[PDB]
Amino acid sequence: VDPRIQGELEKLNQSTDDINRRETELEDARQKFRSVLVEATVKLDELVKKIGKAVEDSKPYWEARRVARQAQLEAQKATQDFQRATEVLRAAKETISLAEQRLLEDDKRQFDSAWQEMLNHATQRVAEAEQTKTRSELVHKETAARYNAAMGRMRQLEKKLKRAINKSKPYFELKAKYYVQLEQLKKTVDDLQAKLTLAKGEYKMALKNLEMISDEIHEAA
């Protein structure tokens, strides 16, 4: 059946012509990635060759800053986890203290069937609430120490290398501007090719639809 195959032919023909774009749109994005990559390294080398001692001397400071960025997130999460651990023990103390007066000696005996049901639930949680609160608190002592200790090294190094630091700041930022640009080009290249794989994939599926259709026509009469 001449129409049966021509329906897959043009379905295959449109898919393979789309690939010719994708192969260029990838190669173009790939080459531009190469071009920015090589310019990034040569403009940064000239900046090192001028005055590059400041760069190596600044590395102990920037590492001491890298350590600090970590310790401050650790301290913040320990801060927020301690803020939660206090709020549970409080709600457990408020629940118990409020329920204590009503039930003790049963001077009031109102909803006395229901009050303990909340008090005993509270009684059980306090055992764990006090465990976990002391836990997060002690960890908060560790992290807040590590935090304000990592700052002390960075600050003292800032005093000890402030000259080298102020000269390497333009170097790191032109490196960062180029990085994020390269990061931008790296992202565009990576998904543009996977887009082609799904394009090539849908092309190869046509060659099987034809391998079967021609086989379906053949097994007729």
Curated annotation (Swiss-Prot):
The keyword Coiled coil applies. Residues 1-221 are annotated as: Sufficient for interaction with RAB11A and for guanine nucleotide exchange activity. One of its GO terms (cellular component) is nuclear body. It comes from the Eukaryota. Keywords: Coiled coil, Cytoplasmic vesicle, Guanine-nucleotide releasing factor, Membrane, Mitochondrion, Phosphoprotein, SH3-binding. GO terms for molecular function: guanyl-nucleotide exchange factor activity; protein kinase inhibitor activity; SH3 domain binding. Interacts with BTK. Interacts with all isoforms of MAPK8, MAPK9, MAPK10 and MAPK12. Interacts with GDP-bound and nucleotide-free forms of RAB11A. This is SH3 domain-binding protein 5. It comes from Homo sapiens. The gene is SH3BP5.
